[PDB]
């Protein structure tokens, strides 16, 4: 059919200086630089095409932009008429070539204006075959799976091996994980083995808490050591295409990533709540001076249900991501805001709850130990001053000893153990002070013999009321055994590592914002530095502003695996040597 008067524009034709347009030979011989606003010359138009050929990277955009660019920069001109590109040719780029409007914006002549791009025009570029599909620039890899595509750059996905770190750093972090993972694995297994060998004696609170603590660090170690199996790391971290496993469970991928995630994360969070059960056990152990065997229902409910709820909540929002350096799948690697709510929030909480029971625990210990020490001090002041009154050859010696006794009795009256028991204790000293005041009156009158005799009566007021409560105060504090204080030592030892773990995830969370910015800028640099560069000069490589600290990661792994080793030393006693020697004697 004859061409529409509107699907063309009046422009003087000039012969084509280039027989080829972006790698494809042209079916016509004349062109016009009227459609390209940025160009006035054919040489200028060609140079702009070299700038636009920088979109070779991001194939989904390159596939549709190629016919549009030839239709604008090198269009067909015949008998003082240039053929305009159709609207459908222009509109087809808007979607995949979203990278253009995000960075430099679409030029005025390349915006789909009803005038600049009329509807249903015979494009002519439809007859030209653009064989070039496109390739992905480092650190992106070519993929046709849409679930793996990196933001606006369609057709490209981030490579499986962490681009922010070298192979030297990869092997170094793997050797670090191999060393800490295996020793924790052997330490926890040995500890679990002693517990099951003497199961009926071992299965008793609070000793049984550390078994379940070691159980968590053992299961967790299995997940961390999984990657060291022949080609397992790539089965857990890499996608089918060759990209990083991000946004899992997804659909068409293997469960190998989510399986390792559940193994690591569930065991991690179960280990932190079992630590809180330990801090609570040590808190309530001083309140026995209420058995823990009854509260087993509350412990096993919270320690196994709460990590399950969090594991399920992550798999629902699908935030399971894989990392090649760590060699495991975890929550919030890509979306760090999810790592704050599922890693920093529960670790922040266990520090508050666990910390409270550890602080209130020593507060109960040091308060009860001081109250006894102060009572013993006042009790000894009374006994020492009684001897002074017995030996006193004058009333000034009797008066001075009694005033010191009055101050000691009133001070010891204020003392409270950690009420009808308090009523008789306070009244016991009320009688004594009242008797001291009567003895002081005799000393003030000068009656030494009468004040000395009145002082002998204080001895029985002390034995009848005071002595009965002093023996009780001593017995309650004697009830504090070594296993009780050892539990607290382990509690603070575990608290330390949890405080370090928190600080590491807090550092990663605080600086991820810039690490992602430094990455996007690095990726965009790889496509910018390739364009607008002299033909003779080799392409200079781009750099990353900032990346995660491998030292902070190593400190986090030391804190995580450190707890697993430190909690395994609960069975490094005399009694556990007996269990292995008696089983060895049974075998041979
Ligand atoms: C991740 C990668 C693929 C995205 C980066 C694509 C780069 C190469 C794109 C994005 C915006 C583009 C520019 C948008 C506008 C113009 C104006 C025109 O007069 C000459 C070309 C030029 C300057 C384009 C050249 C290529 C460009 C810089
Ligand atoms: C390269 O050019 C684009 C133009 O849109 C710009 O947005 C981008 O930031 C540039 N890259 C660098 C690293 O400056
Ligand atoms: C390039 O074109 C030829 C035909 O000219 C075709 O056989 C080949 O497959 C094309 N290349 C690609 C990668 O499509
Ligand atoms: Na022009
Ligand atoms: Na899956």
CA 41–ligand 1 middle distance (angstroms)? 20
Give the three-state DSSP class for 278: helix
* Cα 153 to Cα 103: distance, rounded to the nearest angstrom: 12
Please, which residues have CB within 8 angstroms of residue 558's CB and are 6 or more apart in sequence? 180, 500
Sequence-distant contacts of 576-585: CB under 8 A, at least 24 apart: 576/194, 579/194, 579/197, 579/198, 580/194, 580/197, 583/197
Tokens found for residue 155: 């057709």
Q: Is the CB of 144 under 6 A from ligand 1?
A: no
Q: What is the dihedral of CA 208, 210, 213, 217, to 10 degrees?
A: -130
CA distance 335 to 189: 35
**Over the range 290-328, which residues count as b (16 or more CB within 10 Å of their CB) and which as e?**
eebeeeeeebeeebeebbeebbeebbeeebbbbbbbbbb
Cα(93) to ligand 1 centroid in Å equals: 13
The Cα–Cα gap between 215 and 193 comes to: 10
Distance CA 163, CA 543 (A): 11
Distance CA 149, CA 58 (A): 10
E strand spans, 288-428:
320-322, 329-331
Q: Three-class SS of residue 244?
A: strand
- Reading the block at residue 565, the tokens are 């080793």
Query: Cα angle vertex 489, ends 487, 492, to 5°?
Result: 110
- Which residues contact residue 570 at a Cβ distance below 8 angstroms, ignoring those fewer than 6 apart? 191, 207, 210, 214, 486, 490
> What Å distances lie between residue 434 and 410, 454, 570, CA to CA?
11, 11, 54
CA dist 107 and 102 (Å) reads: 12
CA atoms within 13 A on the CB side of 17: 11
171-178 own/partner pairs: CB under 8 Å, 24+ apart: 172/550, 173/325, 173/326, 173/550, 173/553, 173/554, 174/227, 174/228, 174/325, 174/327, 176/554, 176/557, 177/224, 177/225, 177/227, 177/326, 177/327, 177/557, 178/225, 178/228
- Say yes or no: CB of residue 390 within 6 Å of ligand 1: no
Q: Which residues of 552-564 are buried (b: 16+ CB within 10 A; e: fewer)?
A: ebbbbbbbbbbbb
- Using the Cα atoms of residue 207, residue 213, residue 219 and residue 223 in order, give the sign of their dihedral: negative
Taking phi over 0 as left and psi of -120 to 50 as alpha, with beta for the rest, 158 belongs to: beta
CATH 1.20.1070.10 for the 165-367+481-588 domain, yes or no? yes
Which residues, other chains included, contact 233 with Cβ-Cβ below 8 Å and sequence gap of 6+?
227, 324, 327
**Residue nearest atom 2 of ligand 2, based on CA coordinates:** 528
Q: Which atom of ligand 2 is nearest to the CA of 542?
A: 13
Going from the C-alpha of 423 to that of each of 379, 426, 469, 560, the distances in angstroms are 19, 5, 12, 51
| Ligand 4 ion local residues (Cβ < 5 A) | 37
If you measure from the C-alpha of residue 306 to the centroid of ligand 5, how many angstroms do you get, rounded to a whole number?
23
Alpha carbon of 131 to ligand 3 centroid (Å): 6
Evaluate whether 275 touches 498 at the Cβ level (below 8 Å).
yes
Whole-angstrom Cα Rg for the chain = 41
Residue nearest to atom 7 of ligand 2 (CA): 103
79: left (phi over 0), alpha (psi -120 to 50) or beta: left
Per the CB < 8 A criterion, the answer to whether 303 and 212 are in contact is yes
Handedness of CA 50, 52, 58, 64 (dihedral sign): negative
Assign 243 to helix, strand or coil: strand
- Partners of 25 in beta bridges: 20
Asked whether 278 and 210 are in contact (CB, 8 A), the reply is yes
CA of 54 to the centre of ligand 1 (A): 7
Top mutation candidate among 46, 54, 107, 528 for ligand 1, by most atoms within 8 Å of CB: 54
d(CA 479, CA 125): 93
16 by DSSP, 3-state: which?
coil
C-beta of residue 140 within 8 angstroms of C-beta of residue 159:
yes
Give 253 Cα–ligand 5 centroid separation in angstroms.
5
Cβ neighbors of 506 (< 8 A, separation 6 or more) are 344
CA–CA dist 147, 197 (Å, integer) = 50
Contact 81, 10 (CB under 8 A): yes
CA–CA distances in Å: residue 323 to residues 49, 123, 239, 265: 39, 47, 11, 14
Indicate the DSSP class of residue 2: P
Q: Is 532 in the pocket of ligand 1 (CB under 6 A)?
A: no
8 Å CB contact between 117 and 104: no
Residue 56 contacts residue 62 (beta carbons within 8 Å): yes
- Residue in the block written with tokens 């379940």: 212
What is the CA angle 577-222-512, rounded to 5?
A: 125
The minimum-distance atom of ligand 2 relative to the CA of 525 is: 13
Candidates 565, 583, 574; CA nearest to 217 is: 565
- Counting ligands in written order, the one closest to the CA of 527 is 1
Beta bridge partners of 321: 330
Taking each helix axis from N to C terminus, what angle separates 420-445 and 448-461, rounded to the nearest 10 degrees? Answer: 170
Burial letters for 152-172: b for 16+ Cβ neighbours within 10 Å, e otherwise? Answer: ebbbbbbbbbbbbbeeeebee
Cα dist. 95→89, 102, 103, 305, 526 in Å?
A: 12, 12, 14, 45, 22
Torsion sign over Cα 275, 276, 279, 285: negative
Q: 462-492: buried (b, 16+ CB within 10 Å) or exposed (e) per residue? A: beebbeebbeebeebbeebeeebeebbebbe
Place of tokens 């480092």: 138
Q: Which residues line ligand 2 (CB under 6 A)?
A: 103-104, 521, 524-525, 528
Q: What six digits make up the tokens of 89? A: 């040719």
Nearest one of 498, 210, 179, 510 to 336, comparing CA atoms: 510
* Closest by Cα among 297, 299, 276, 293 to 361: 276
Is any ligand 1 atom within 6 A of the Cβ of residue 99? Answer: yes
Helices (H) and strands (E) in the chain, counts: 19, 10
* Alpha carbon of 401 to ligand 4 centroid (Å): 113
Which atom of ligand 2 has the smallest separation from the CA of 527? 1
Where in the chain are the domains? 1-135, 165-367+481-588, 368-480
| Atom 13 in ligand 2: residue holding the nearest Cα | 525
Beta carbons of 302 and 296 less than 8 angstroms apart: no
DSSP codes joined into one string, 447-475: -HHHHHHHHHHHHHHIIIIIHHHHHHHHH
Q: How was this structure determined?
A: X-ray
Report whether CATH 1.10.2000.10 matches the domain 1-135: yes
Q: Give the Cα separation of 389 and 396 in Å (integer).
A: 10
Question: Does ligand 1 come within 6 angstroms of the Cβ of 54?
Answer: yes
The answer to whether residues 292 and 215 touch, using CB atoms and an 8 Å cutoff, is no
In Å, how far from its chain's centre is CA 307?
14
| Residue 340 DSSP label | I
Query: 17-48 b/e with 16+ CB inside 10 Å = b?
Result: eeeebbebebebebbbbbbbebbeebeebeeb
Closest alpha carbon to 61 in 19, 32, 103: 103
Q: Is 573 helix (H, G, I), strand (E, B) or coil?
A: coil
- Do 39 and 520 touch, CB atoms closer than 8 A? no
* 342 C-beta neighbours (distance < 10 Å), count: 21
Q: Which residues pair with 81 in a beta bridge?
A: 10
Q: Probe ligand 2: pick from 51, 524, 542, max atoms within 8 Å of CB?
A: 524
Reference 358, options 521, 515, 247, 494; nearest CA is: 494
If we measure between CA atoms, which residue out of 105, 33, 109 comes closest to residue 76? 33
- Cα atoms in the Cβ-side hemisphere of radius 13 Å centred on 478: 6
Q: What does the block give as tokens for 62? A: 């390159």
Residue nearest to atom 3 of ligand 2 (CA): 103
């Amino acid at each position: 059919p004859p061409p529409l008067s509107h699907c063309g524009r009046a422009a003087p034709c000039e012969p084509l200086r280039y027989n080829v347009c972006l790698g494809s030979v042209l079916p016509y011989g004349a062109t016009s630089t009227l459609l390209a606003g940025d160009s006035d010359s054919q040489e200028e138009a060609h140079g702009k095409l070299v700038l636009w050929s920088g979109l070779r990277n991001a194939p989904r955009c390159w596939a549709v932009i190629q016919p549009l660019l030839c239709a604008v920069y090198m269009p067909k001109c015949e008998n003082d008429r240039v053929e305009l590109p159709s609207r459908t040719l222009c509109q087809a780029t808007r979607g995949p070539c979203a990278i253009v409007e995000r960075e430099r914006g679409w030029p005025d002549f390349l915006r789909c204006t009803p005038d600049r791009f009329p509807e249903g025009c015979t494009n002519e570029v439809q007859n030209i075959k653009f064989n070039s599909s496109g390739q992905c620039e480092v650190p992106l890899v070519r993929t046709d799976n849409p679930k793996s595509w990196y933001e606006d750059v369609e057709g490209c996905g981030i490579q499986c091996q962490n681009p922010l770190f070298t192979e030297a750093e990869h092997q170094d972090m793997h050797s670090y994980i191999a060393a800490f993972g295996a020793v924790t694995g052997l330490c926890t297994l040995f500890t679990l083995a002693t517990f099951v060998a003497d199961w009926r004696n071992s299965n008793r609170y609070p000793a049984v808490i550390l078994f379940y603590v070691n159980a968590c660090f053992f299961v967790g170690s299995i997940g961390w050591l999984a990657q060291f199996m022949d080609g397992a790391r790539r089965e857990i971290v890499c996608r089918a295409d060759g990209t990083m496993r991000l946004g899992e469970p997804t659909s068409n991928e293997t469960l190998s990533c989510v399986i390792i995630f559940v193994i690591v994360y569930y065991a991690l969070m179960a280990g932190f709540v079992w630590f809180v059960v330990l801090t609570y056990a040590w808190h309530t152990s001083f309140k026995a001076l209420q058995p823990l065997s009854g509260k087993t229902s509350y412990f096993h409910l919270l320690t196994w249900s709460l990590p399950f709820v969090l594991t399920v909540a992550i798999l629902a929002v699908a935030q399971v991501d894989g990392d090649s350096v760590s060699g495991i799948c975890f929550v919030g690697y890509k979306n760090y805001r999810y790592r704050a709510g599922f890693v920093l929030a529960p670790i922040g909480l266990v520090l508050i709850v666990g910390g409270y029971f550890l602080i209130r625990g020593v507060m109960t210990l040091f308060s009860a130990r001081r109250q006894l020490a102060d009572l013993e001090d006042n009790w000894e002041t009374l006994n020492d001053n009684l001897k002074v009154i017995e030996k006193a050859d004058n009333a000034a010696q009797v008066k001075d000893a009694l005033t010191k006794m009055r101050a000691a009795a009133l001070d010891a009256q204020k003392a409270t153990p950690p009420s009808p028991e308090m009523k008789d204790f306070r009244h016991g000293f009320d009688i004594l002070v009242g008797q001291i005041d009567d003895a002081l009156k005799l000393a003030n009158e000068g009656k030494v013999k009468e004040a000395q005799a009145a002082a002998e009566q204080l001895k029985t007021t002390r034995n009848a009321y005071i002595q009965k409560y002093l023996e009780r105060a001593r017995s309650t504090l004697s009830k504090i055994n070594e296993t009780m204080l050892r539990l607290g030592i382990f509690g603070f030892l575990a608290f330390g590592f949890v405080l370090i773990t928190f600080s590491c995830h807090f550092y990663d969370f605080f600086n991820q914002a810039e690490w992602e910015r430094s990455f996007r800028d690095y990726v965009l640099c790889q496509a910018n530095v390739t364009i607008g560069l002299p033909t003779k000069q080799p392409i200079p490589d781009c750099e990353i502003k900032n990346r995660p600290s491998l030292l902070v990661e190593k400190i986090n792994l030391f804190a995580m695996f450190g707890t697993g080793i430190a909690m395994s030393t609960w069975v490094w006693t005399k009694a556990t040597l007996l269990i292995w020697r008696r089983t060895w004697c049974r075998l041979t």
